[PDB]
């Protein structure tokens, strides 16, 4: 059954070309389906960009048709997006889709999506700070990691508590001074930490950086 | 229109039914096959209805759709906590010759009111060394979403330097969580002893108060 994954840069500078690729697996691109691109800006809705079929017929969002090229390569099982003269407004999650055309125009499946930021700001890795309880507990204990001063989105925070299961909350980032801050909380039985180690791992693909913090008692 | 009109929000309890509408100008939707997408926060949209009323294989029959021509409607019956998501309709607009999505509807799954579990955290030595001091409060697994947080430094309210961030609704227990972060300079942080995070939530007329005193160390 159809498998899709997007690739490309997470950061592009204004006026440069945004080039994304999507690999299609487990399905023939020579069948009667379109292959296309949708985007979604943070906290906003879905926007159809365009699509293409193996015969070469192509459709575009009218407002972007001057900047946008969508193409496919059946030999590589790829569909590509190329958006020229990018501006800040092109910052979005970009999704590859298979489209059943004609009069149906249904989209299934969707790739996991790739986050793209259009900005002149410099890539900055996160600083990661442990959140441990202060001096002076009930049946659970909550710990955290504070992730500060990174750009662009996104980071992924995970918690290594060994074989112990845990309840995690990841808070959405907030931008400030051109830098994002987010945090993550982890909750475990009070009988488990500190004898069971609990460590956050913070990956920031844009800066090729991974930071771990083991939460130790104060 | 270049975006179909949907209500911003619908809310109901598990087992109950909601309907979500999707409208265009006059009877433009009569000329199109409407599809519907479920987007769980943090995931890609997923096709739930196509060609107005058809279900992809594996989508349960409690998701159903219709297209009246003036408005299209997604029904979701037998609500489950995992149904919390944004739902988008979509359809070709022949007048614009473009594929148009709806503005999106967030489905909230109701639950019993729940007080937050509140946890407070001093700044780490590591952060201080670099000049800043963030005091963090987690207010976790509460319902409903509305909540007020106040910070106090030595018992006195602090207005500036507070940033709050909410999660999306939890797919398993229908609660919300929030982080509240008070950022001061290191020098400022070190001038005081007690830091307090107070949560005011409808589950109590009295605030939930969590504090730490630096002199406890």
């Amino acid at each position: 059954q159809v498998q899709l994954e997007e690739s490309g840069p997470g950061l592009v500078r204004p006026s440069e070309t945004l080039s994304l690729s999507c690999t299609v697996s487990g399905f023939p691109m020579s069948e009667s389906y379109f292959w296309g691109w949708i985007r979604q800006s943070p906290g906003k809705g879905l926007e159809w960009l365009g699509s293409v079929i193996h015969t070469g017929t192509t459709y575009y969002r009218p407002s972007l048709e001057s900047r946008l090229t969508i193409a496919m390569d059946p030999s590589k099982n790829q569909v590509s997006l190329s958006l020229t003269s990018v501006t800040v407004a092109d910052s979005a999650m970009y999704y590859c889709v298979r489209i059943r055309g004609g009069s149906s125009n249904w989209l299934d499946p969707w790739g996991p999506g790739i986050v793209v930021t259009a900005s002149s700001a410099k890539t900055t890795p996160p600083s990661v700070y442990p959140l441990a309880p202060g001096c002076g507990t009930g049946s659970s204990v909550t710990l955290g990691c504070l992730v500060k001063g990174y750009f662009p989105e996104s980071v992924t925070v995970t918690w290594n508590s060994g074989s112990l299961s845990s309840s995690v909350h990841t808070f959405p980032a907030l931008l400030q001074s051109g830098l994002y801050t987010m945090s993550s909380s982890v909750t475990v039985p009070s009988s488990t930490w500190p004898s069971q180690t609990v460590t956050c791992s913070v990956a920031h693909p844009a800066s090729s950086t991974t930071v771990d913090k083991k939460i130790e008692p104060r | 229109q270049s975006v179909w009109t949907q209500p911003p929000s619908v809310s109901a309890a598990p087992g109950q039914k909601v309907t979500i509408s999707c409208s265009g100008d006059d009877s433009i939707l009569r000329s199109a096959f409407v599809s519907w997408y479920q987007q769980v926060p943090g995931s890609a949209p997923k096709l739930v209805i196509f060609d107005d009323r058809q279900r992809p294989s594996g989508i349960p029959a409690r998701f159903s759709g219709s297209n009246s021509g003036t408005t299209a409607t997604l029904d979701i019956a037998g609500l489950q906590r995992g149904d919390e998501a944004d739902y988008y309709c979509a359809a070709w607009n022949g007048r614009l010759s473009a594929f148009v999505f709806g503005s999106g509807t967030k489905l909230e799954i109701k639950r019993a009111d729940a007080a937050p579990t509140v946890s407070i955290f001093p700044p780490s030595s590591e952060q201080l060394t670099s000049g800043g001091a963030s005091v963090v409060c987690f207010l976790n697994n509460f319902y409903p979403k509305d909540i007020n947080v106040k910070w106090k430094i030595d018992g006195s309210e602090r207005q500036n330097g507070v940033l709050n961030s909410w999660t999306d609704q939890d797919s398993k227990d229908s609660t919300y969580s929030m982080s509240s972060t008070l950022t001061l300079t290191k020098d400022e942080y070190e001038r005081h002893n007690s830091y307090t995070c107070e949560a005011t939530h409808k589950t109590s007329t009295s605030p939930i108060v969590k504090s730490f005193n630096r002199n406890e160390c």
Binding site: S32, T55, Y59, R100, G101 | W92, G94
Partner: peptide
């Protein structure tokens, strides 16, 4: 044939 284009219902 119709599947080779994208548009409104006939």
């Amino acid at each position: 044939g119709e599947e080779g284009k994208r548009g409104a219902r006939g």
